[PDB]
């Protein structure tokens, strides 16, 4: 009872949201190099036997709609759920191409009371995004 059951018929979905180009209103830069990440993640999760879905350049409304829709799928035959977010961010926030959305809005769709076919199963969110604007200068070892 100490390890999650990972021998359901399917490992589960791996949704990759890859935001590279942002509207001028956001004041955000283009994220050169993110397609390398998106391709690397798709291959990595394919080798782990996840059903990978890559989505590119989603608005904040599209992000919320995609996550709502995924949370309404029947995951009963899936062991787990993975979501990877590649975008700009600040603390608690990820950017759609047209502006910010609270990470809690995304993850709430998957709470144990709201996505019953994932209750008891691991829900992994991998977040490549800034969390603010502090720099770590490091210390010599």
């Amino acid at each position: 009872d100490n390890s999650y059951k990972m021998d359901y018929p399917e490992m589960g979905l791996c949704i990759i949201i890859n935001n590279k180009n942002f509207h001028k209103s956001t004041g955000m830069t283009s994220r050169s190099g993110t397609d390398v990440d998106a391709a690397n993640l798709r291959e990595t999760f394919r080798n782990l036997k996840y059903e990978v879905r890559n989505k590119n350049d989603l608005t904040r409304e599209e992000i919320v709609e995609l996550m709502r829709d995924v949370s309404k799928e029947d995951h009963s035959k899936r062991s787990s759920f993975v979501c990877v977010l590649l975008s700009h961010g600040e603390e608690g926030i990820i950017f759609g191409t047209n502006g910010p959305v609270d990470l809690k809005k995304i993850t709430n769709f998957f709470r144990g009371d709201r996505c019953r076919s994932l209750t008891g199963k691991p829900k992994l969110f991998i977040i490549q995004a800034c969390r603010g604007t502090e720099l770590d200068c490091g210390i010599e070892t």
Partner: protein, 92 residues
């Protein structure tokens, strides 16, 4: 007979709260480069938190920014693993 609605989530953040996260225009982001390398090497052997700890070490030790702007030069990053998991996770 109940579990918490927030249980069984893991948030693998690329950087600590409050910090920038670094991305290389040729190689991809430091965190995702490291995460994919460690999953490729260790997903058939190690538990996920231990894989993520190796990702933390790889990002912290092998990367340092290079910038023509001194303000952004020679900077470092540590990822941040946030686990509300209740069991060990092995991908096999």
């Amino acid at each position: 007979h109940k579990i918490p609605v927030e249980a069984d989530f893991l948030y693998a953040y690329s950087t600590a709260p409050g910090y920038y996260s670094w991305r290389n225009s040729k190689d991809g982001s430091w965190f995702i480069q490291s995460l994919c390398a460690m999953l490729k090497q260790y997903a058939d052997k190690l538990e996920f938190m231990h894989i993520l700890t190796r990702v933390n070490r790889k990002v912290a030790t092998e990367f340092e920014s290079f910038s023509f702007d001194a303000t952004f030069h020679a900077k470092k990053q540590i990822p941040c693993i946030v686990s509300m998991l209740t069991k060990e996770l092995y991908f096999y």
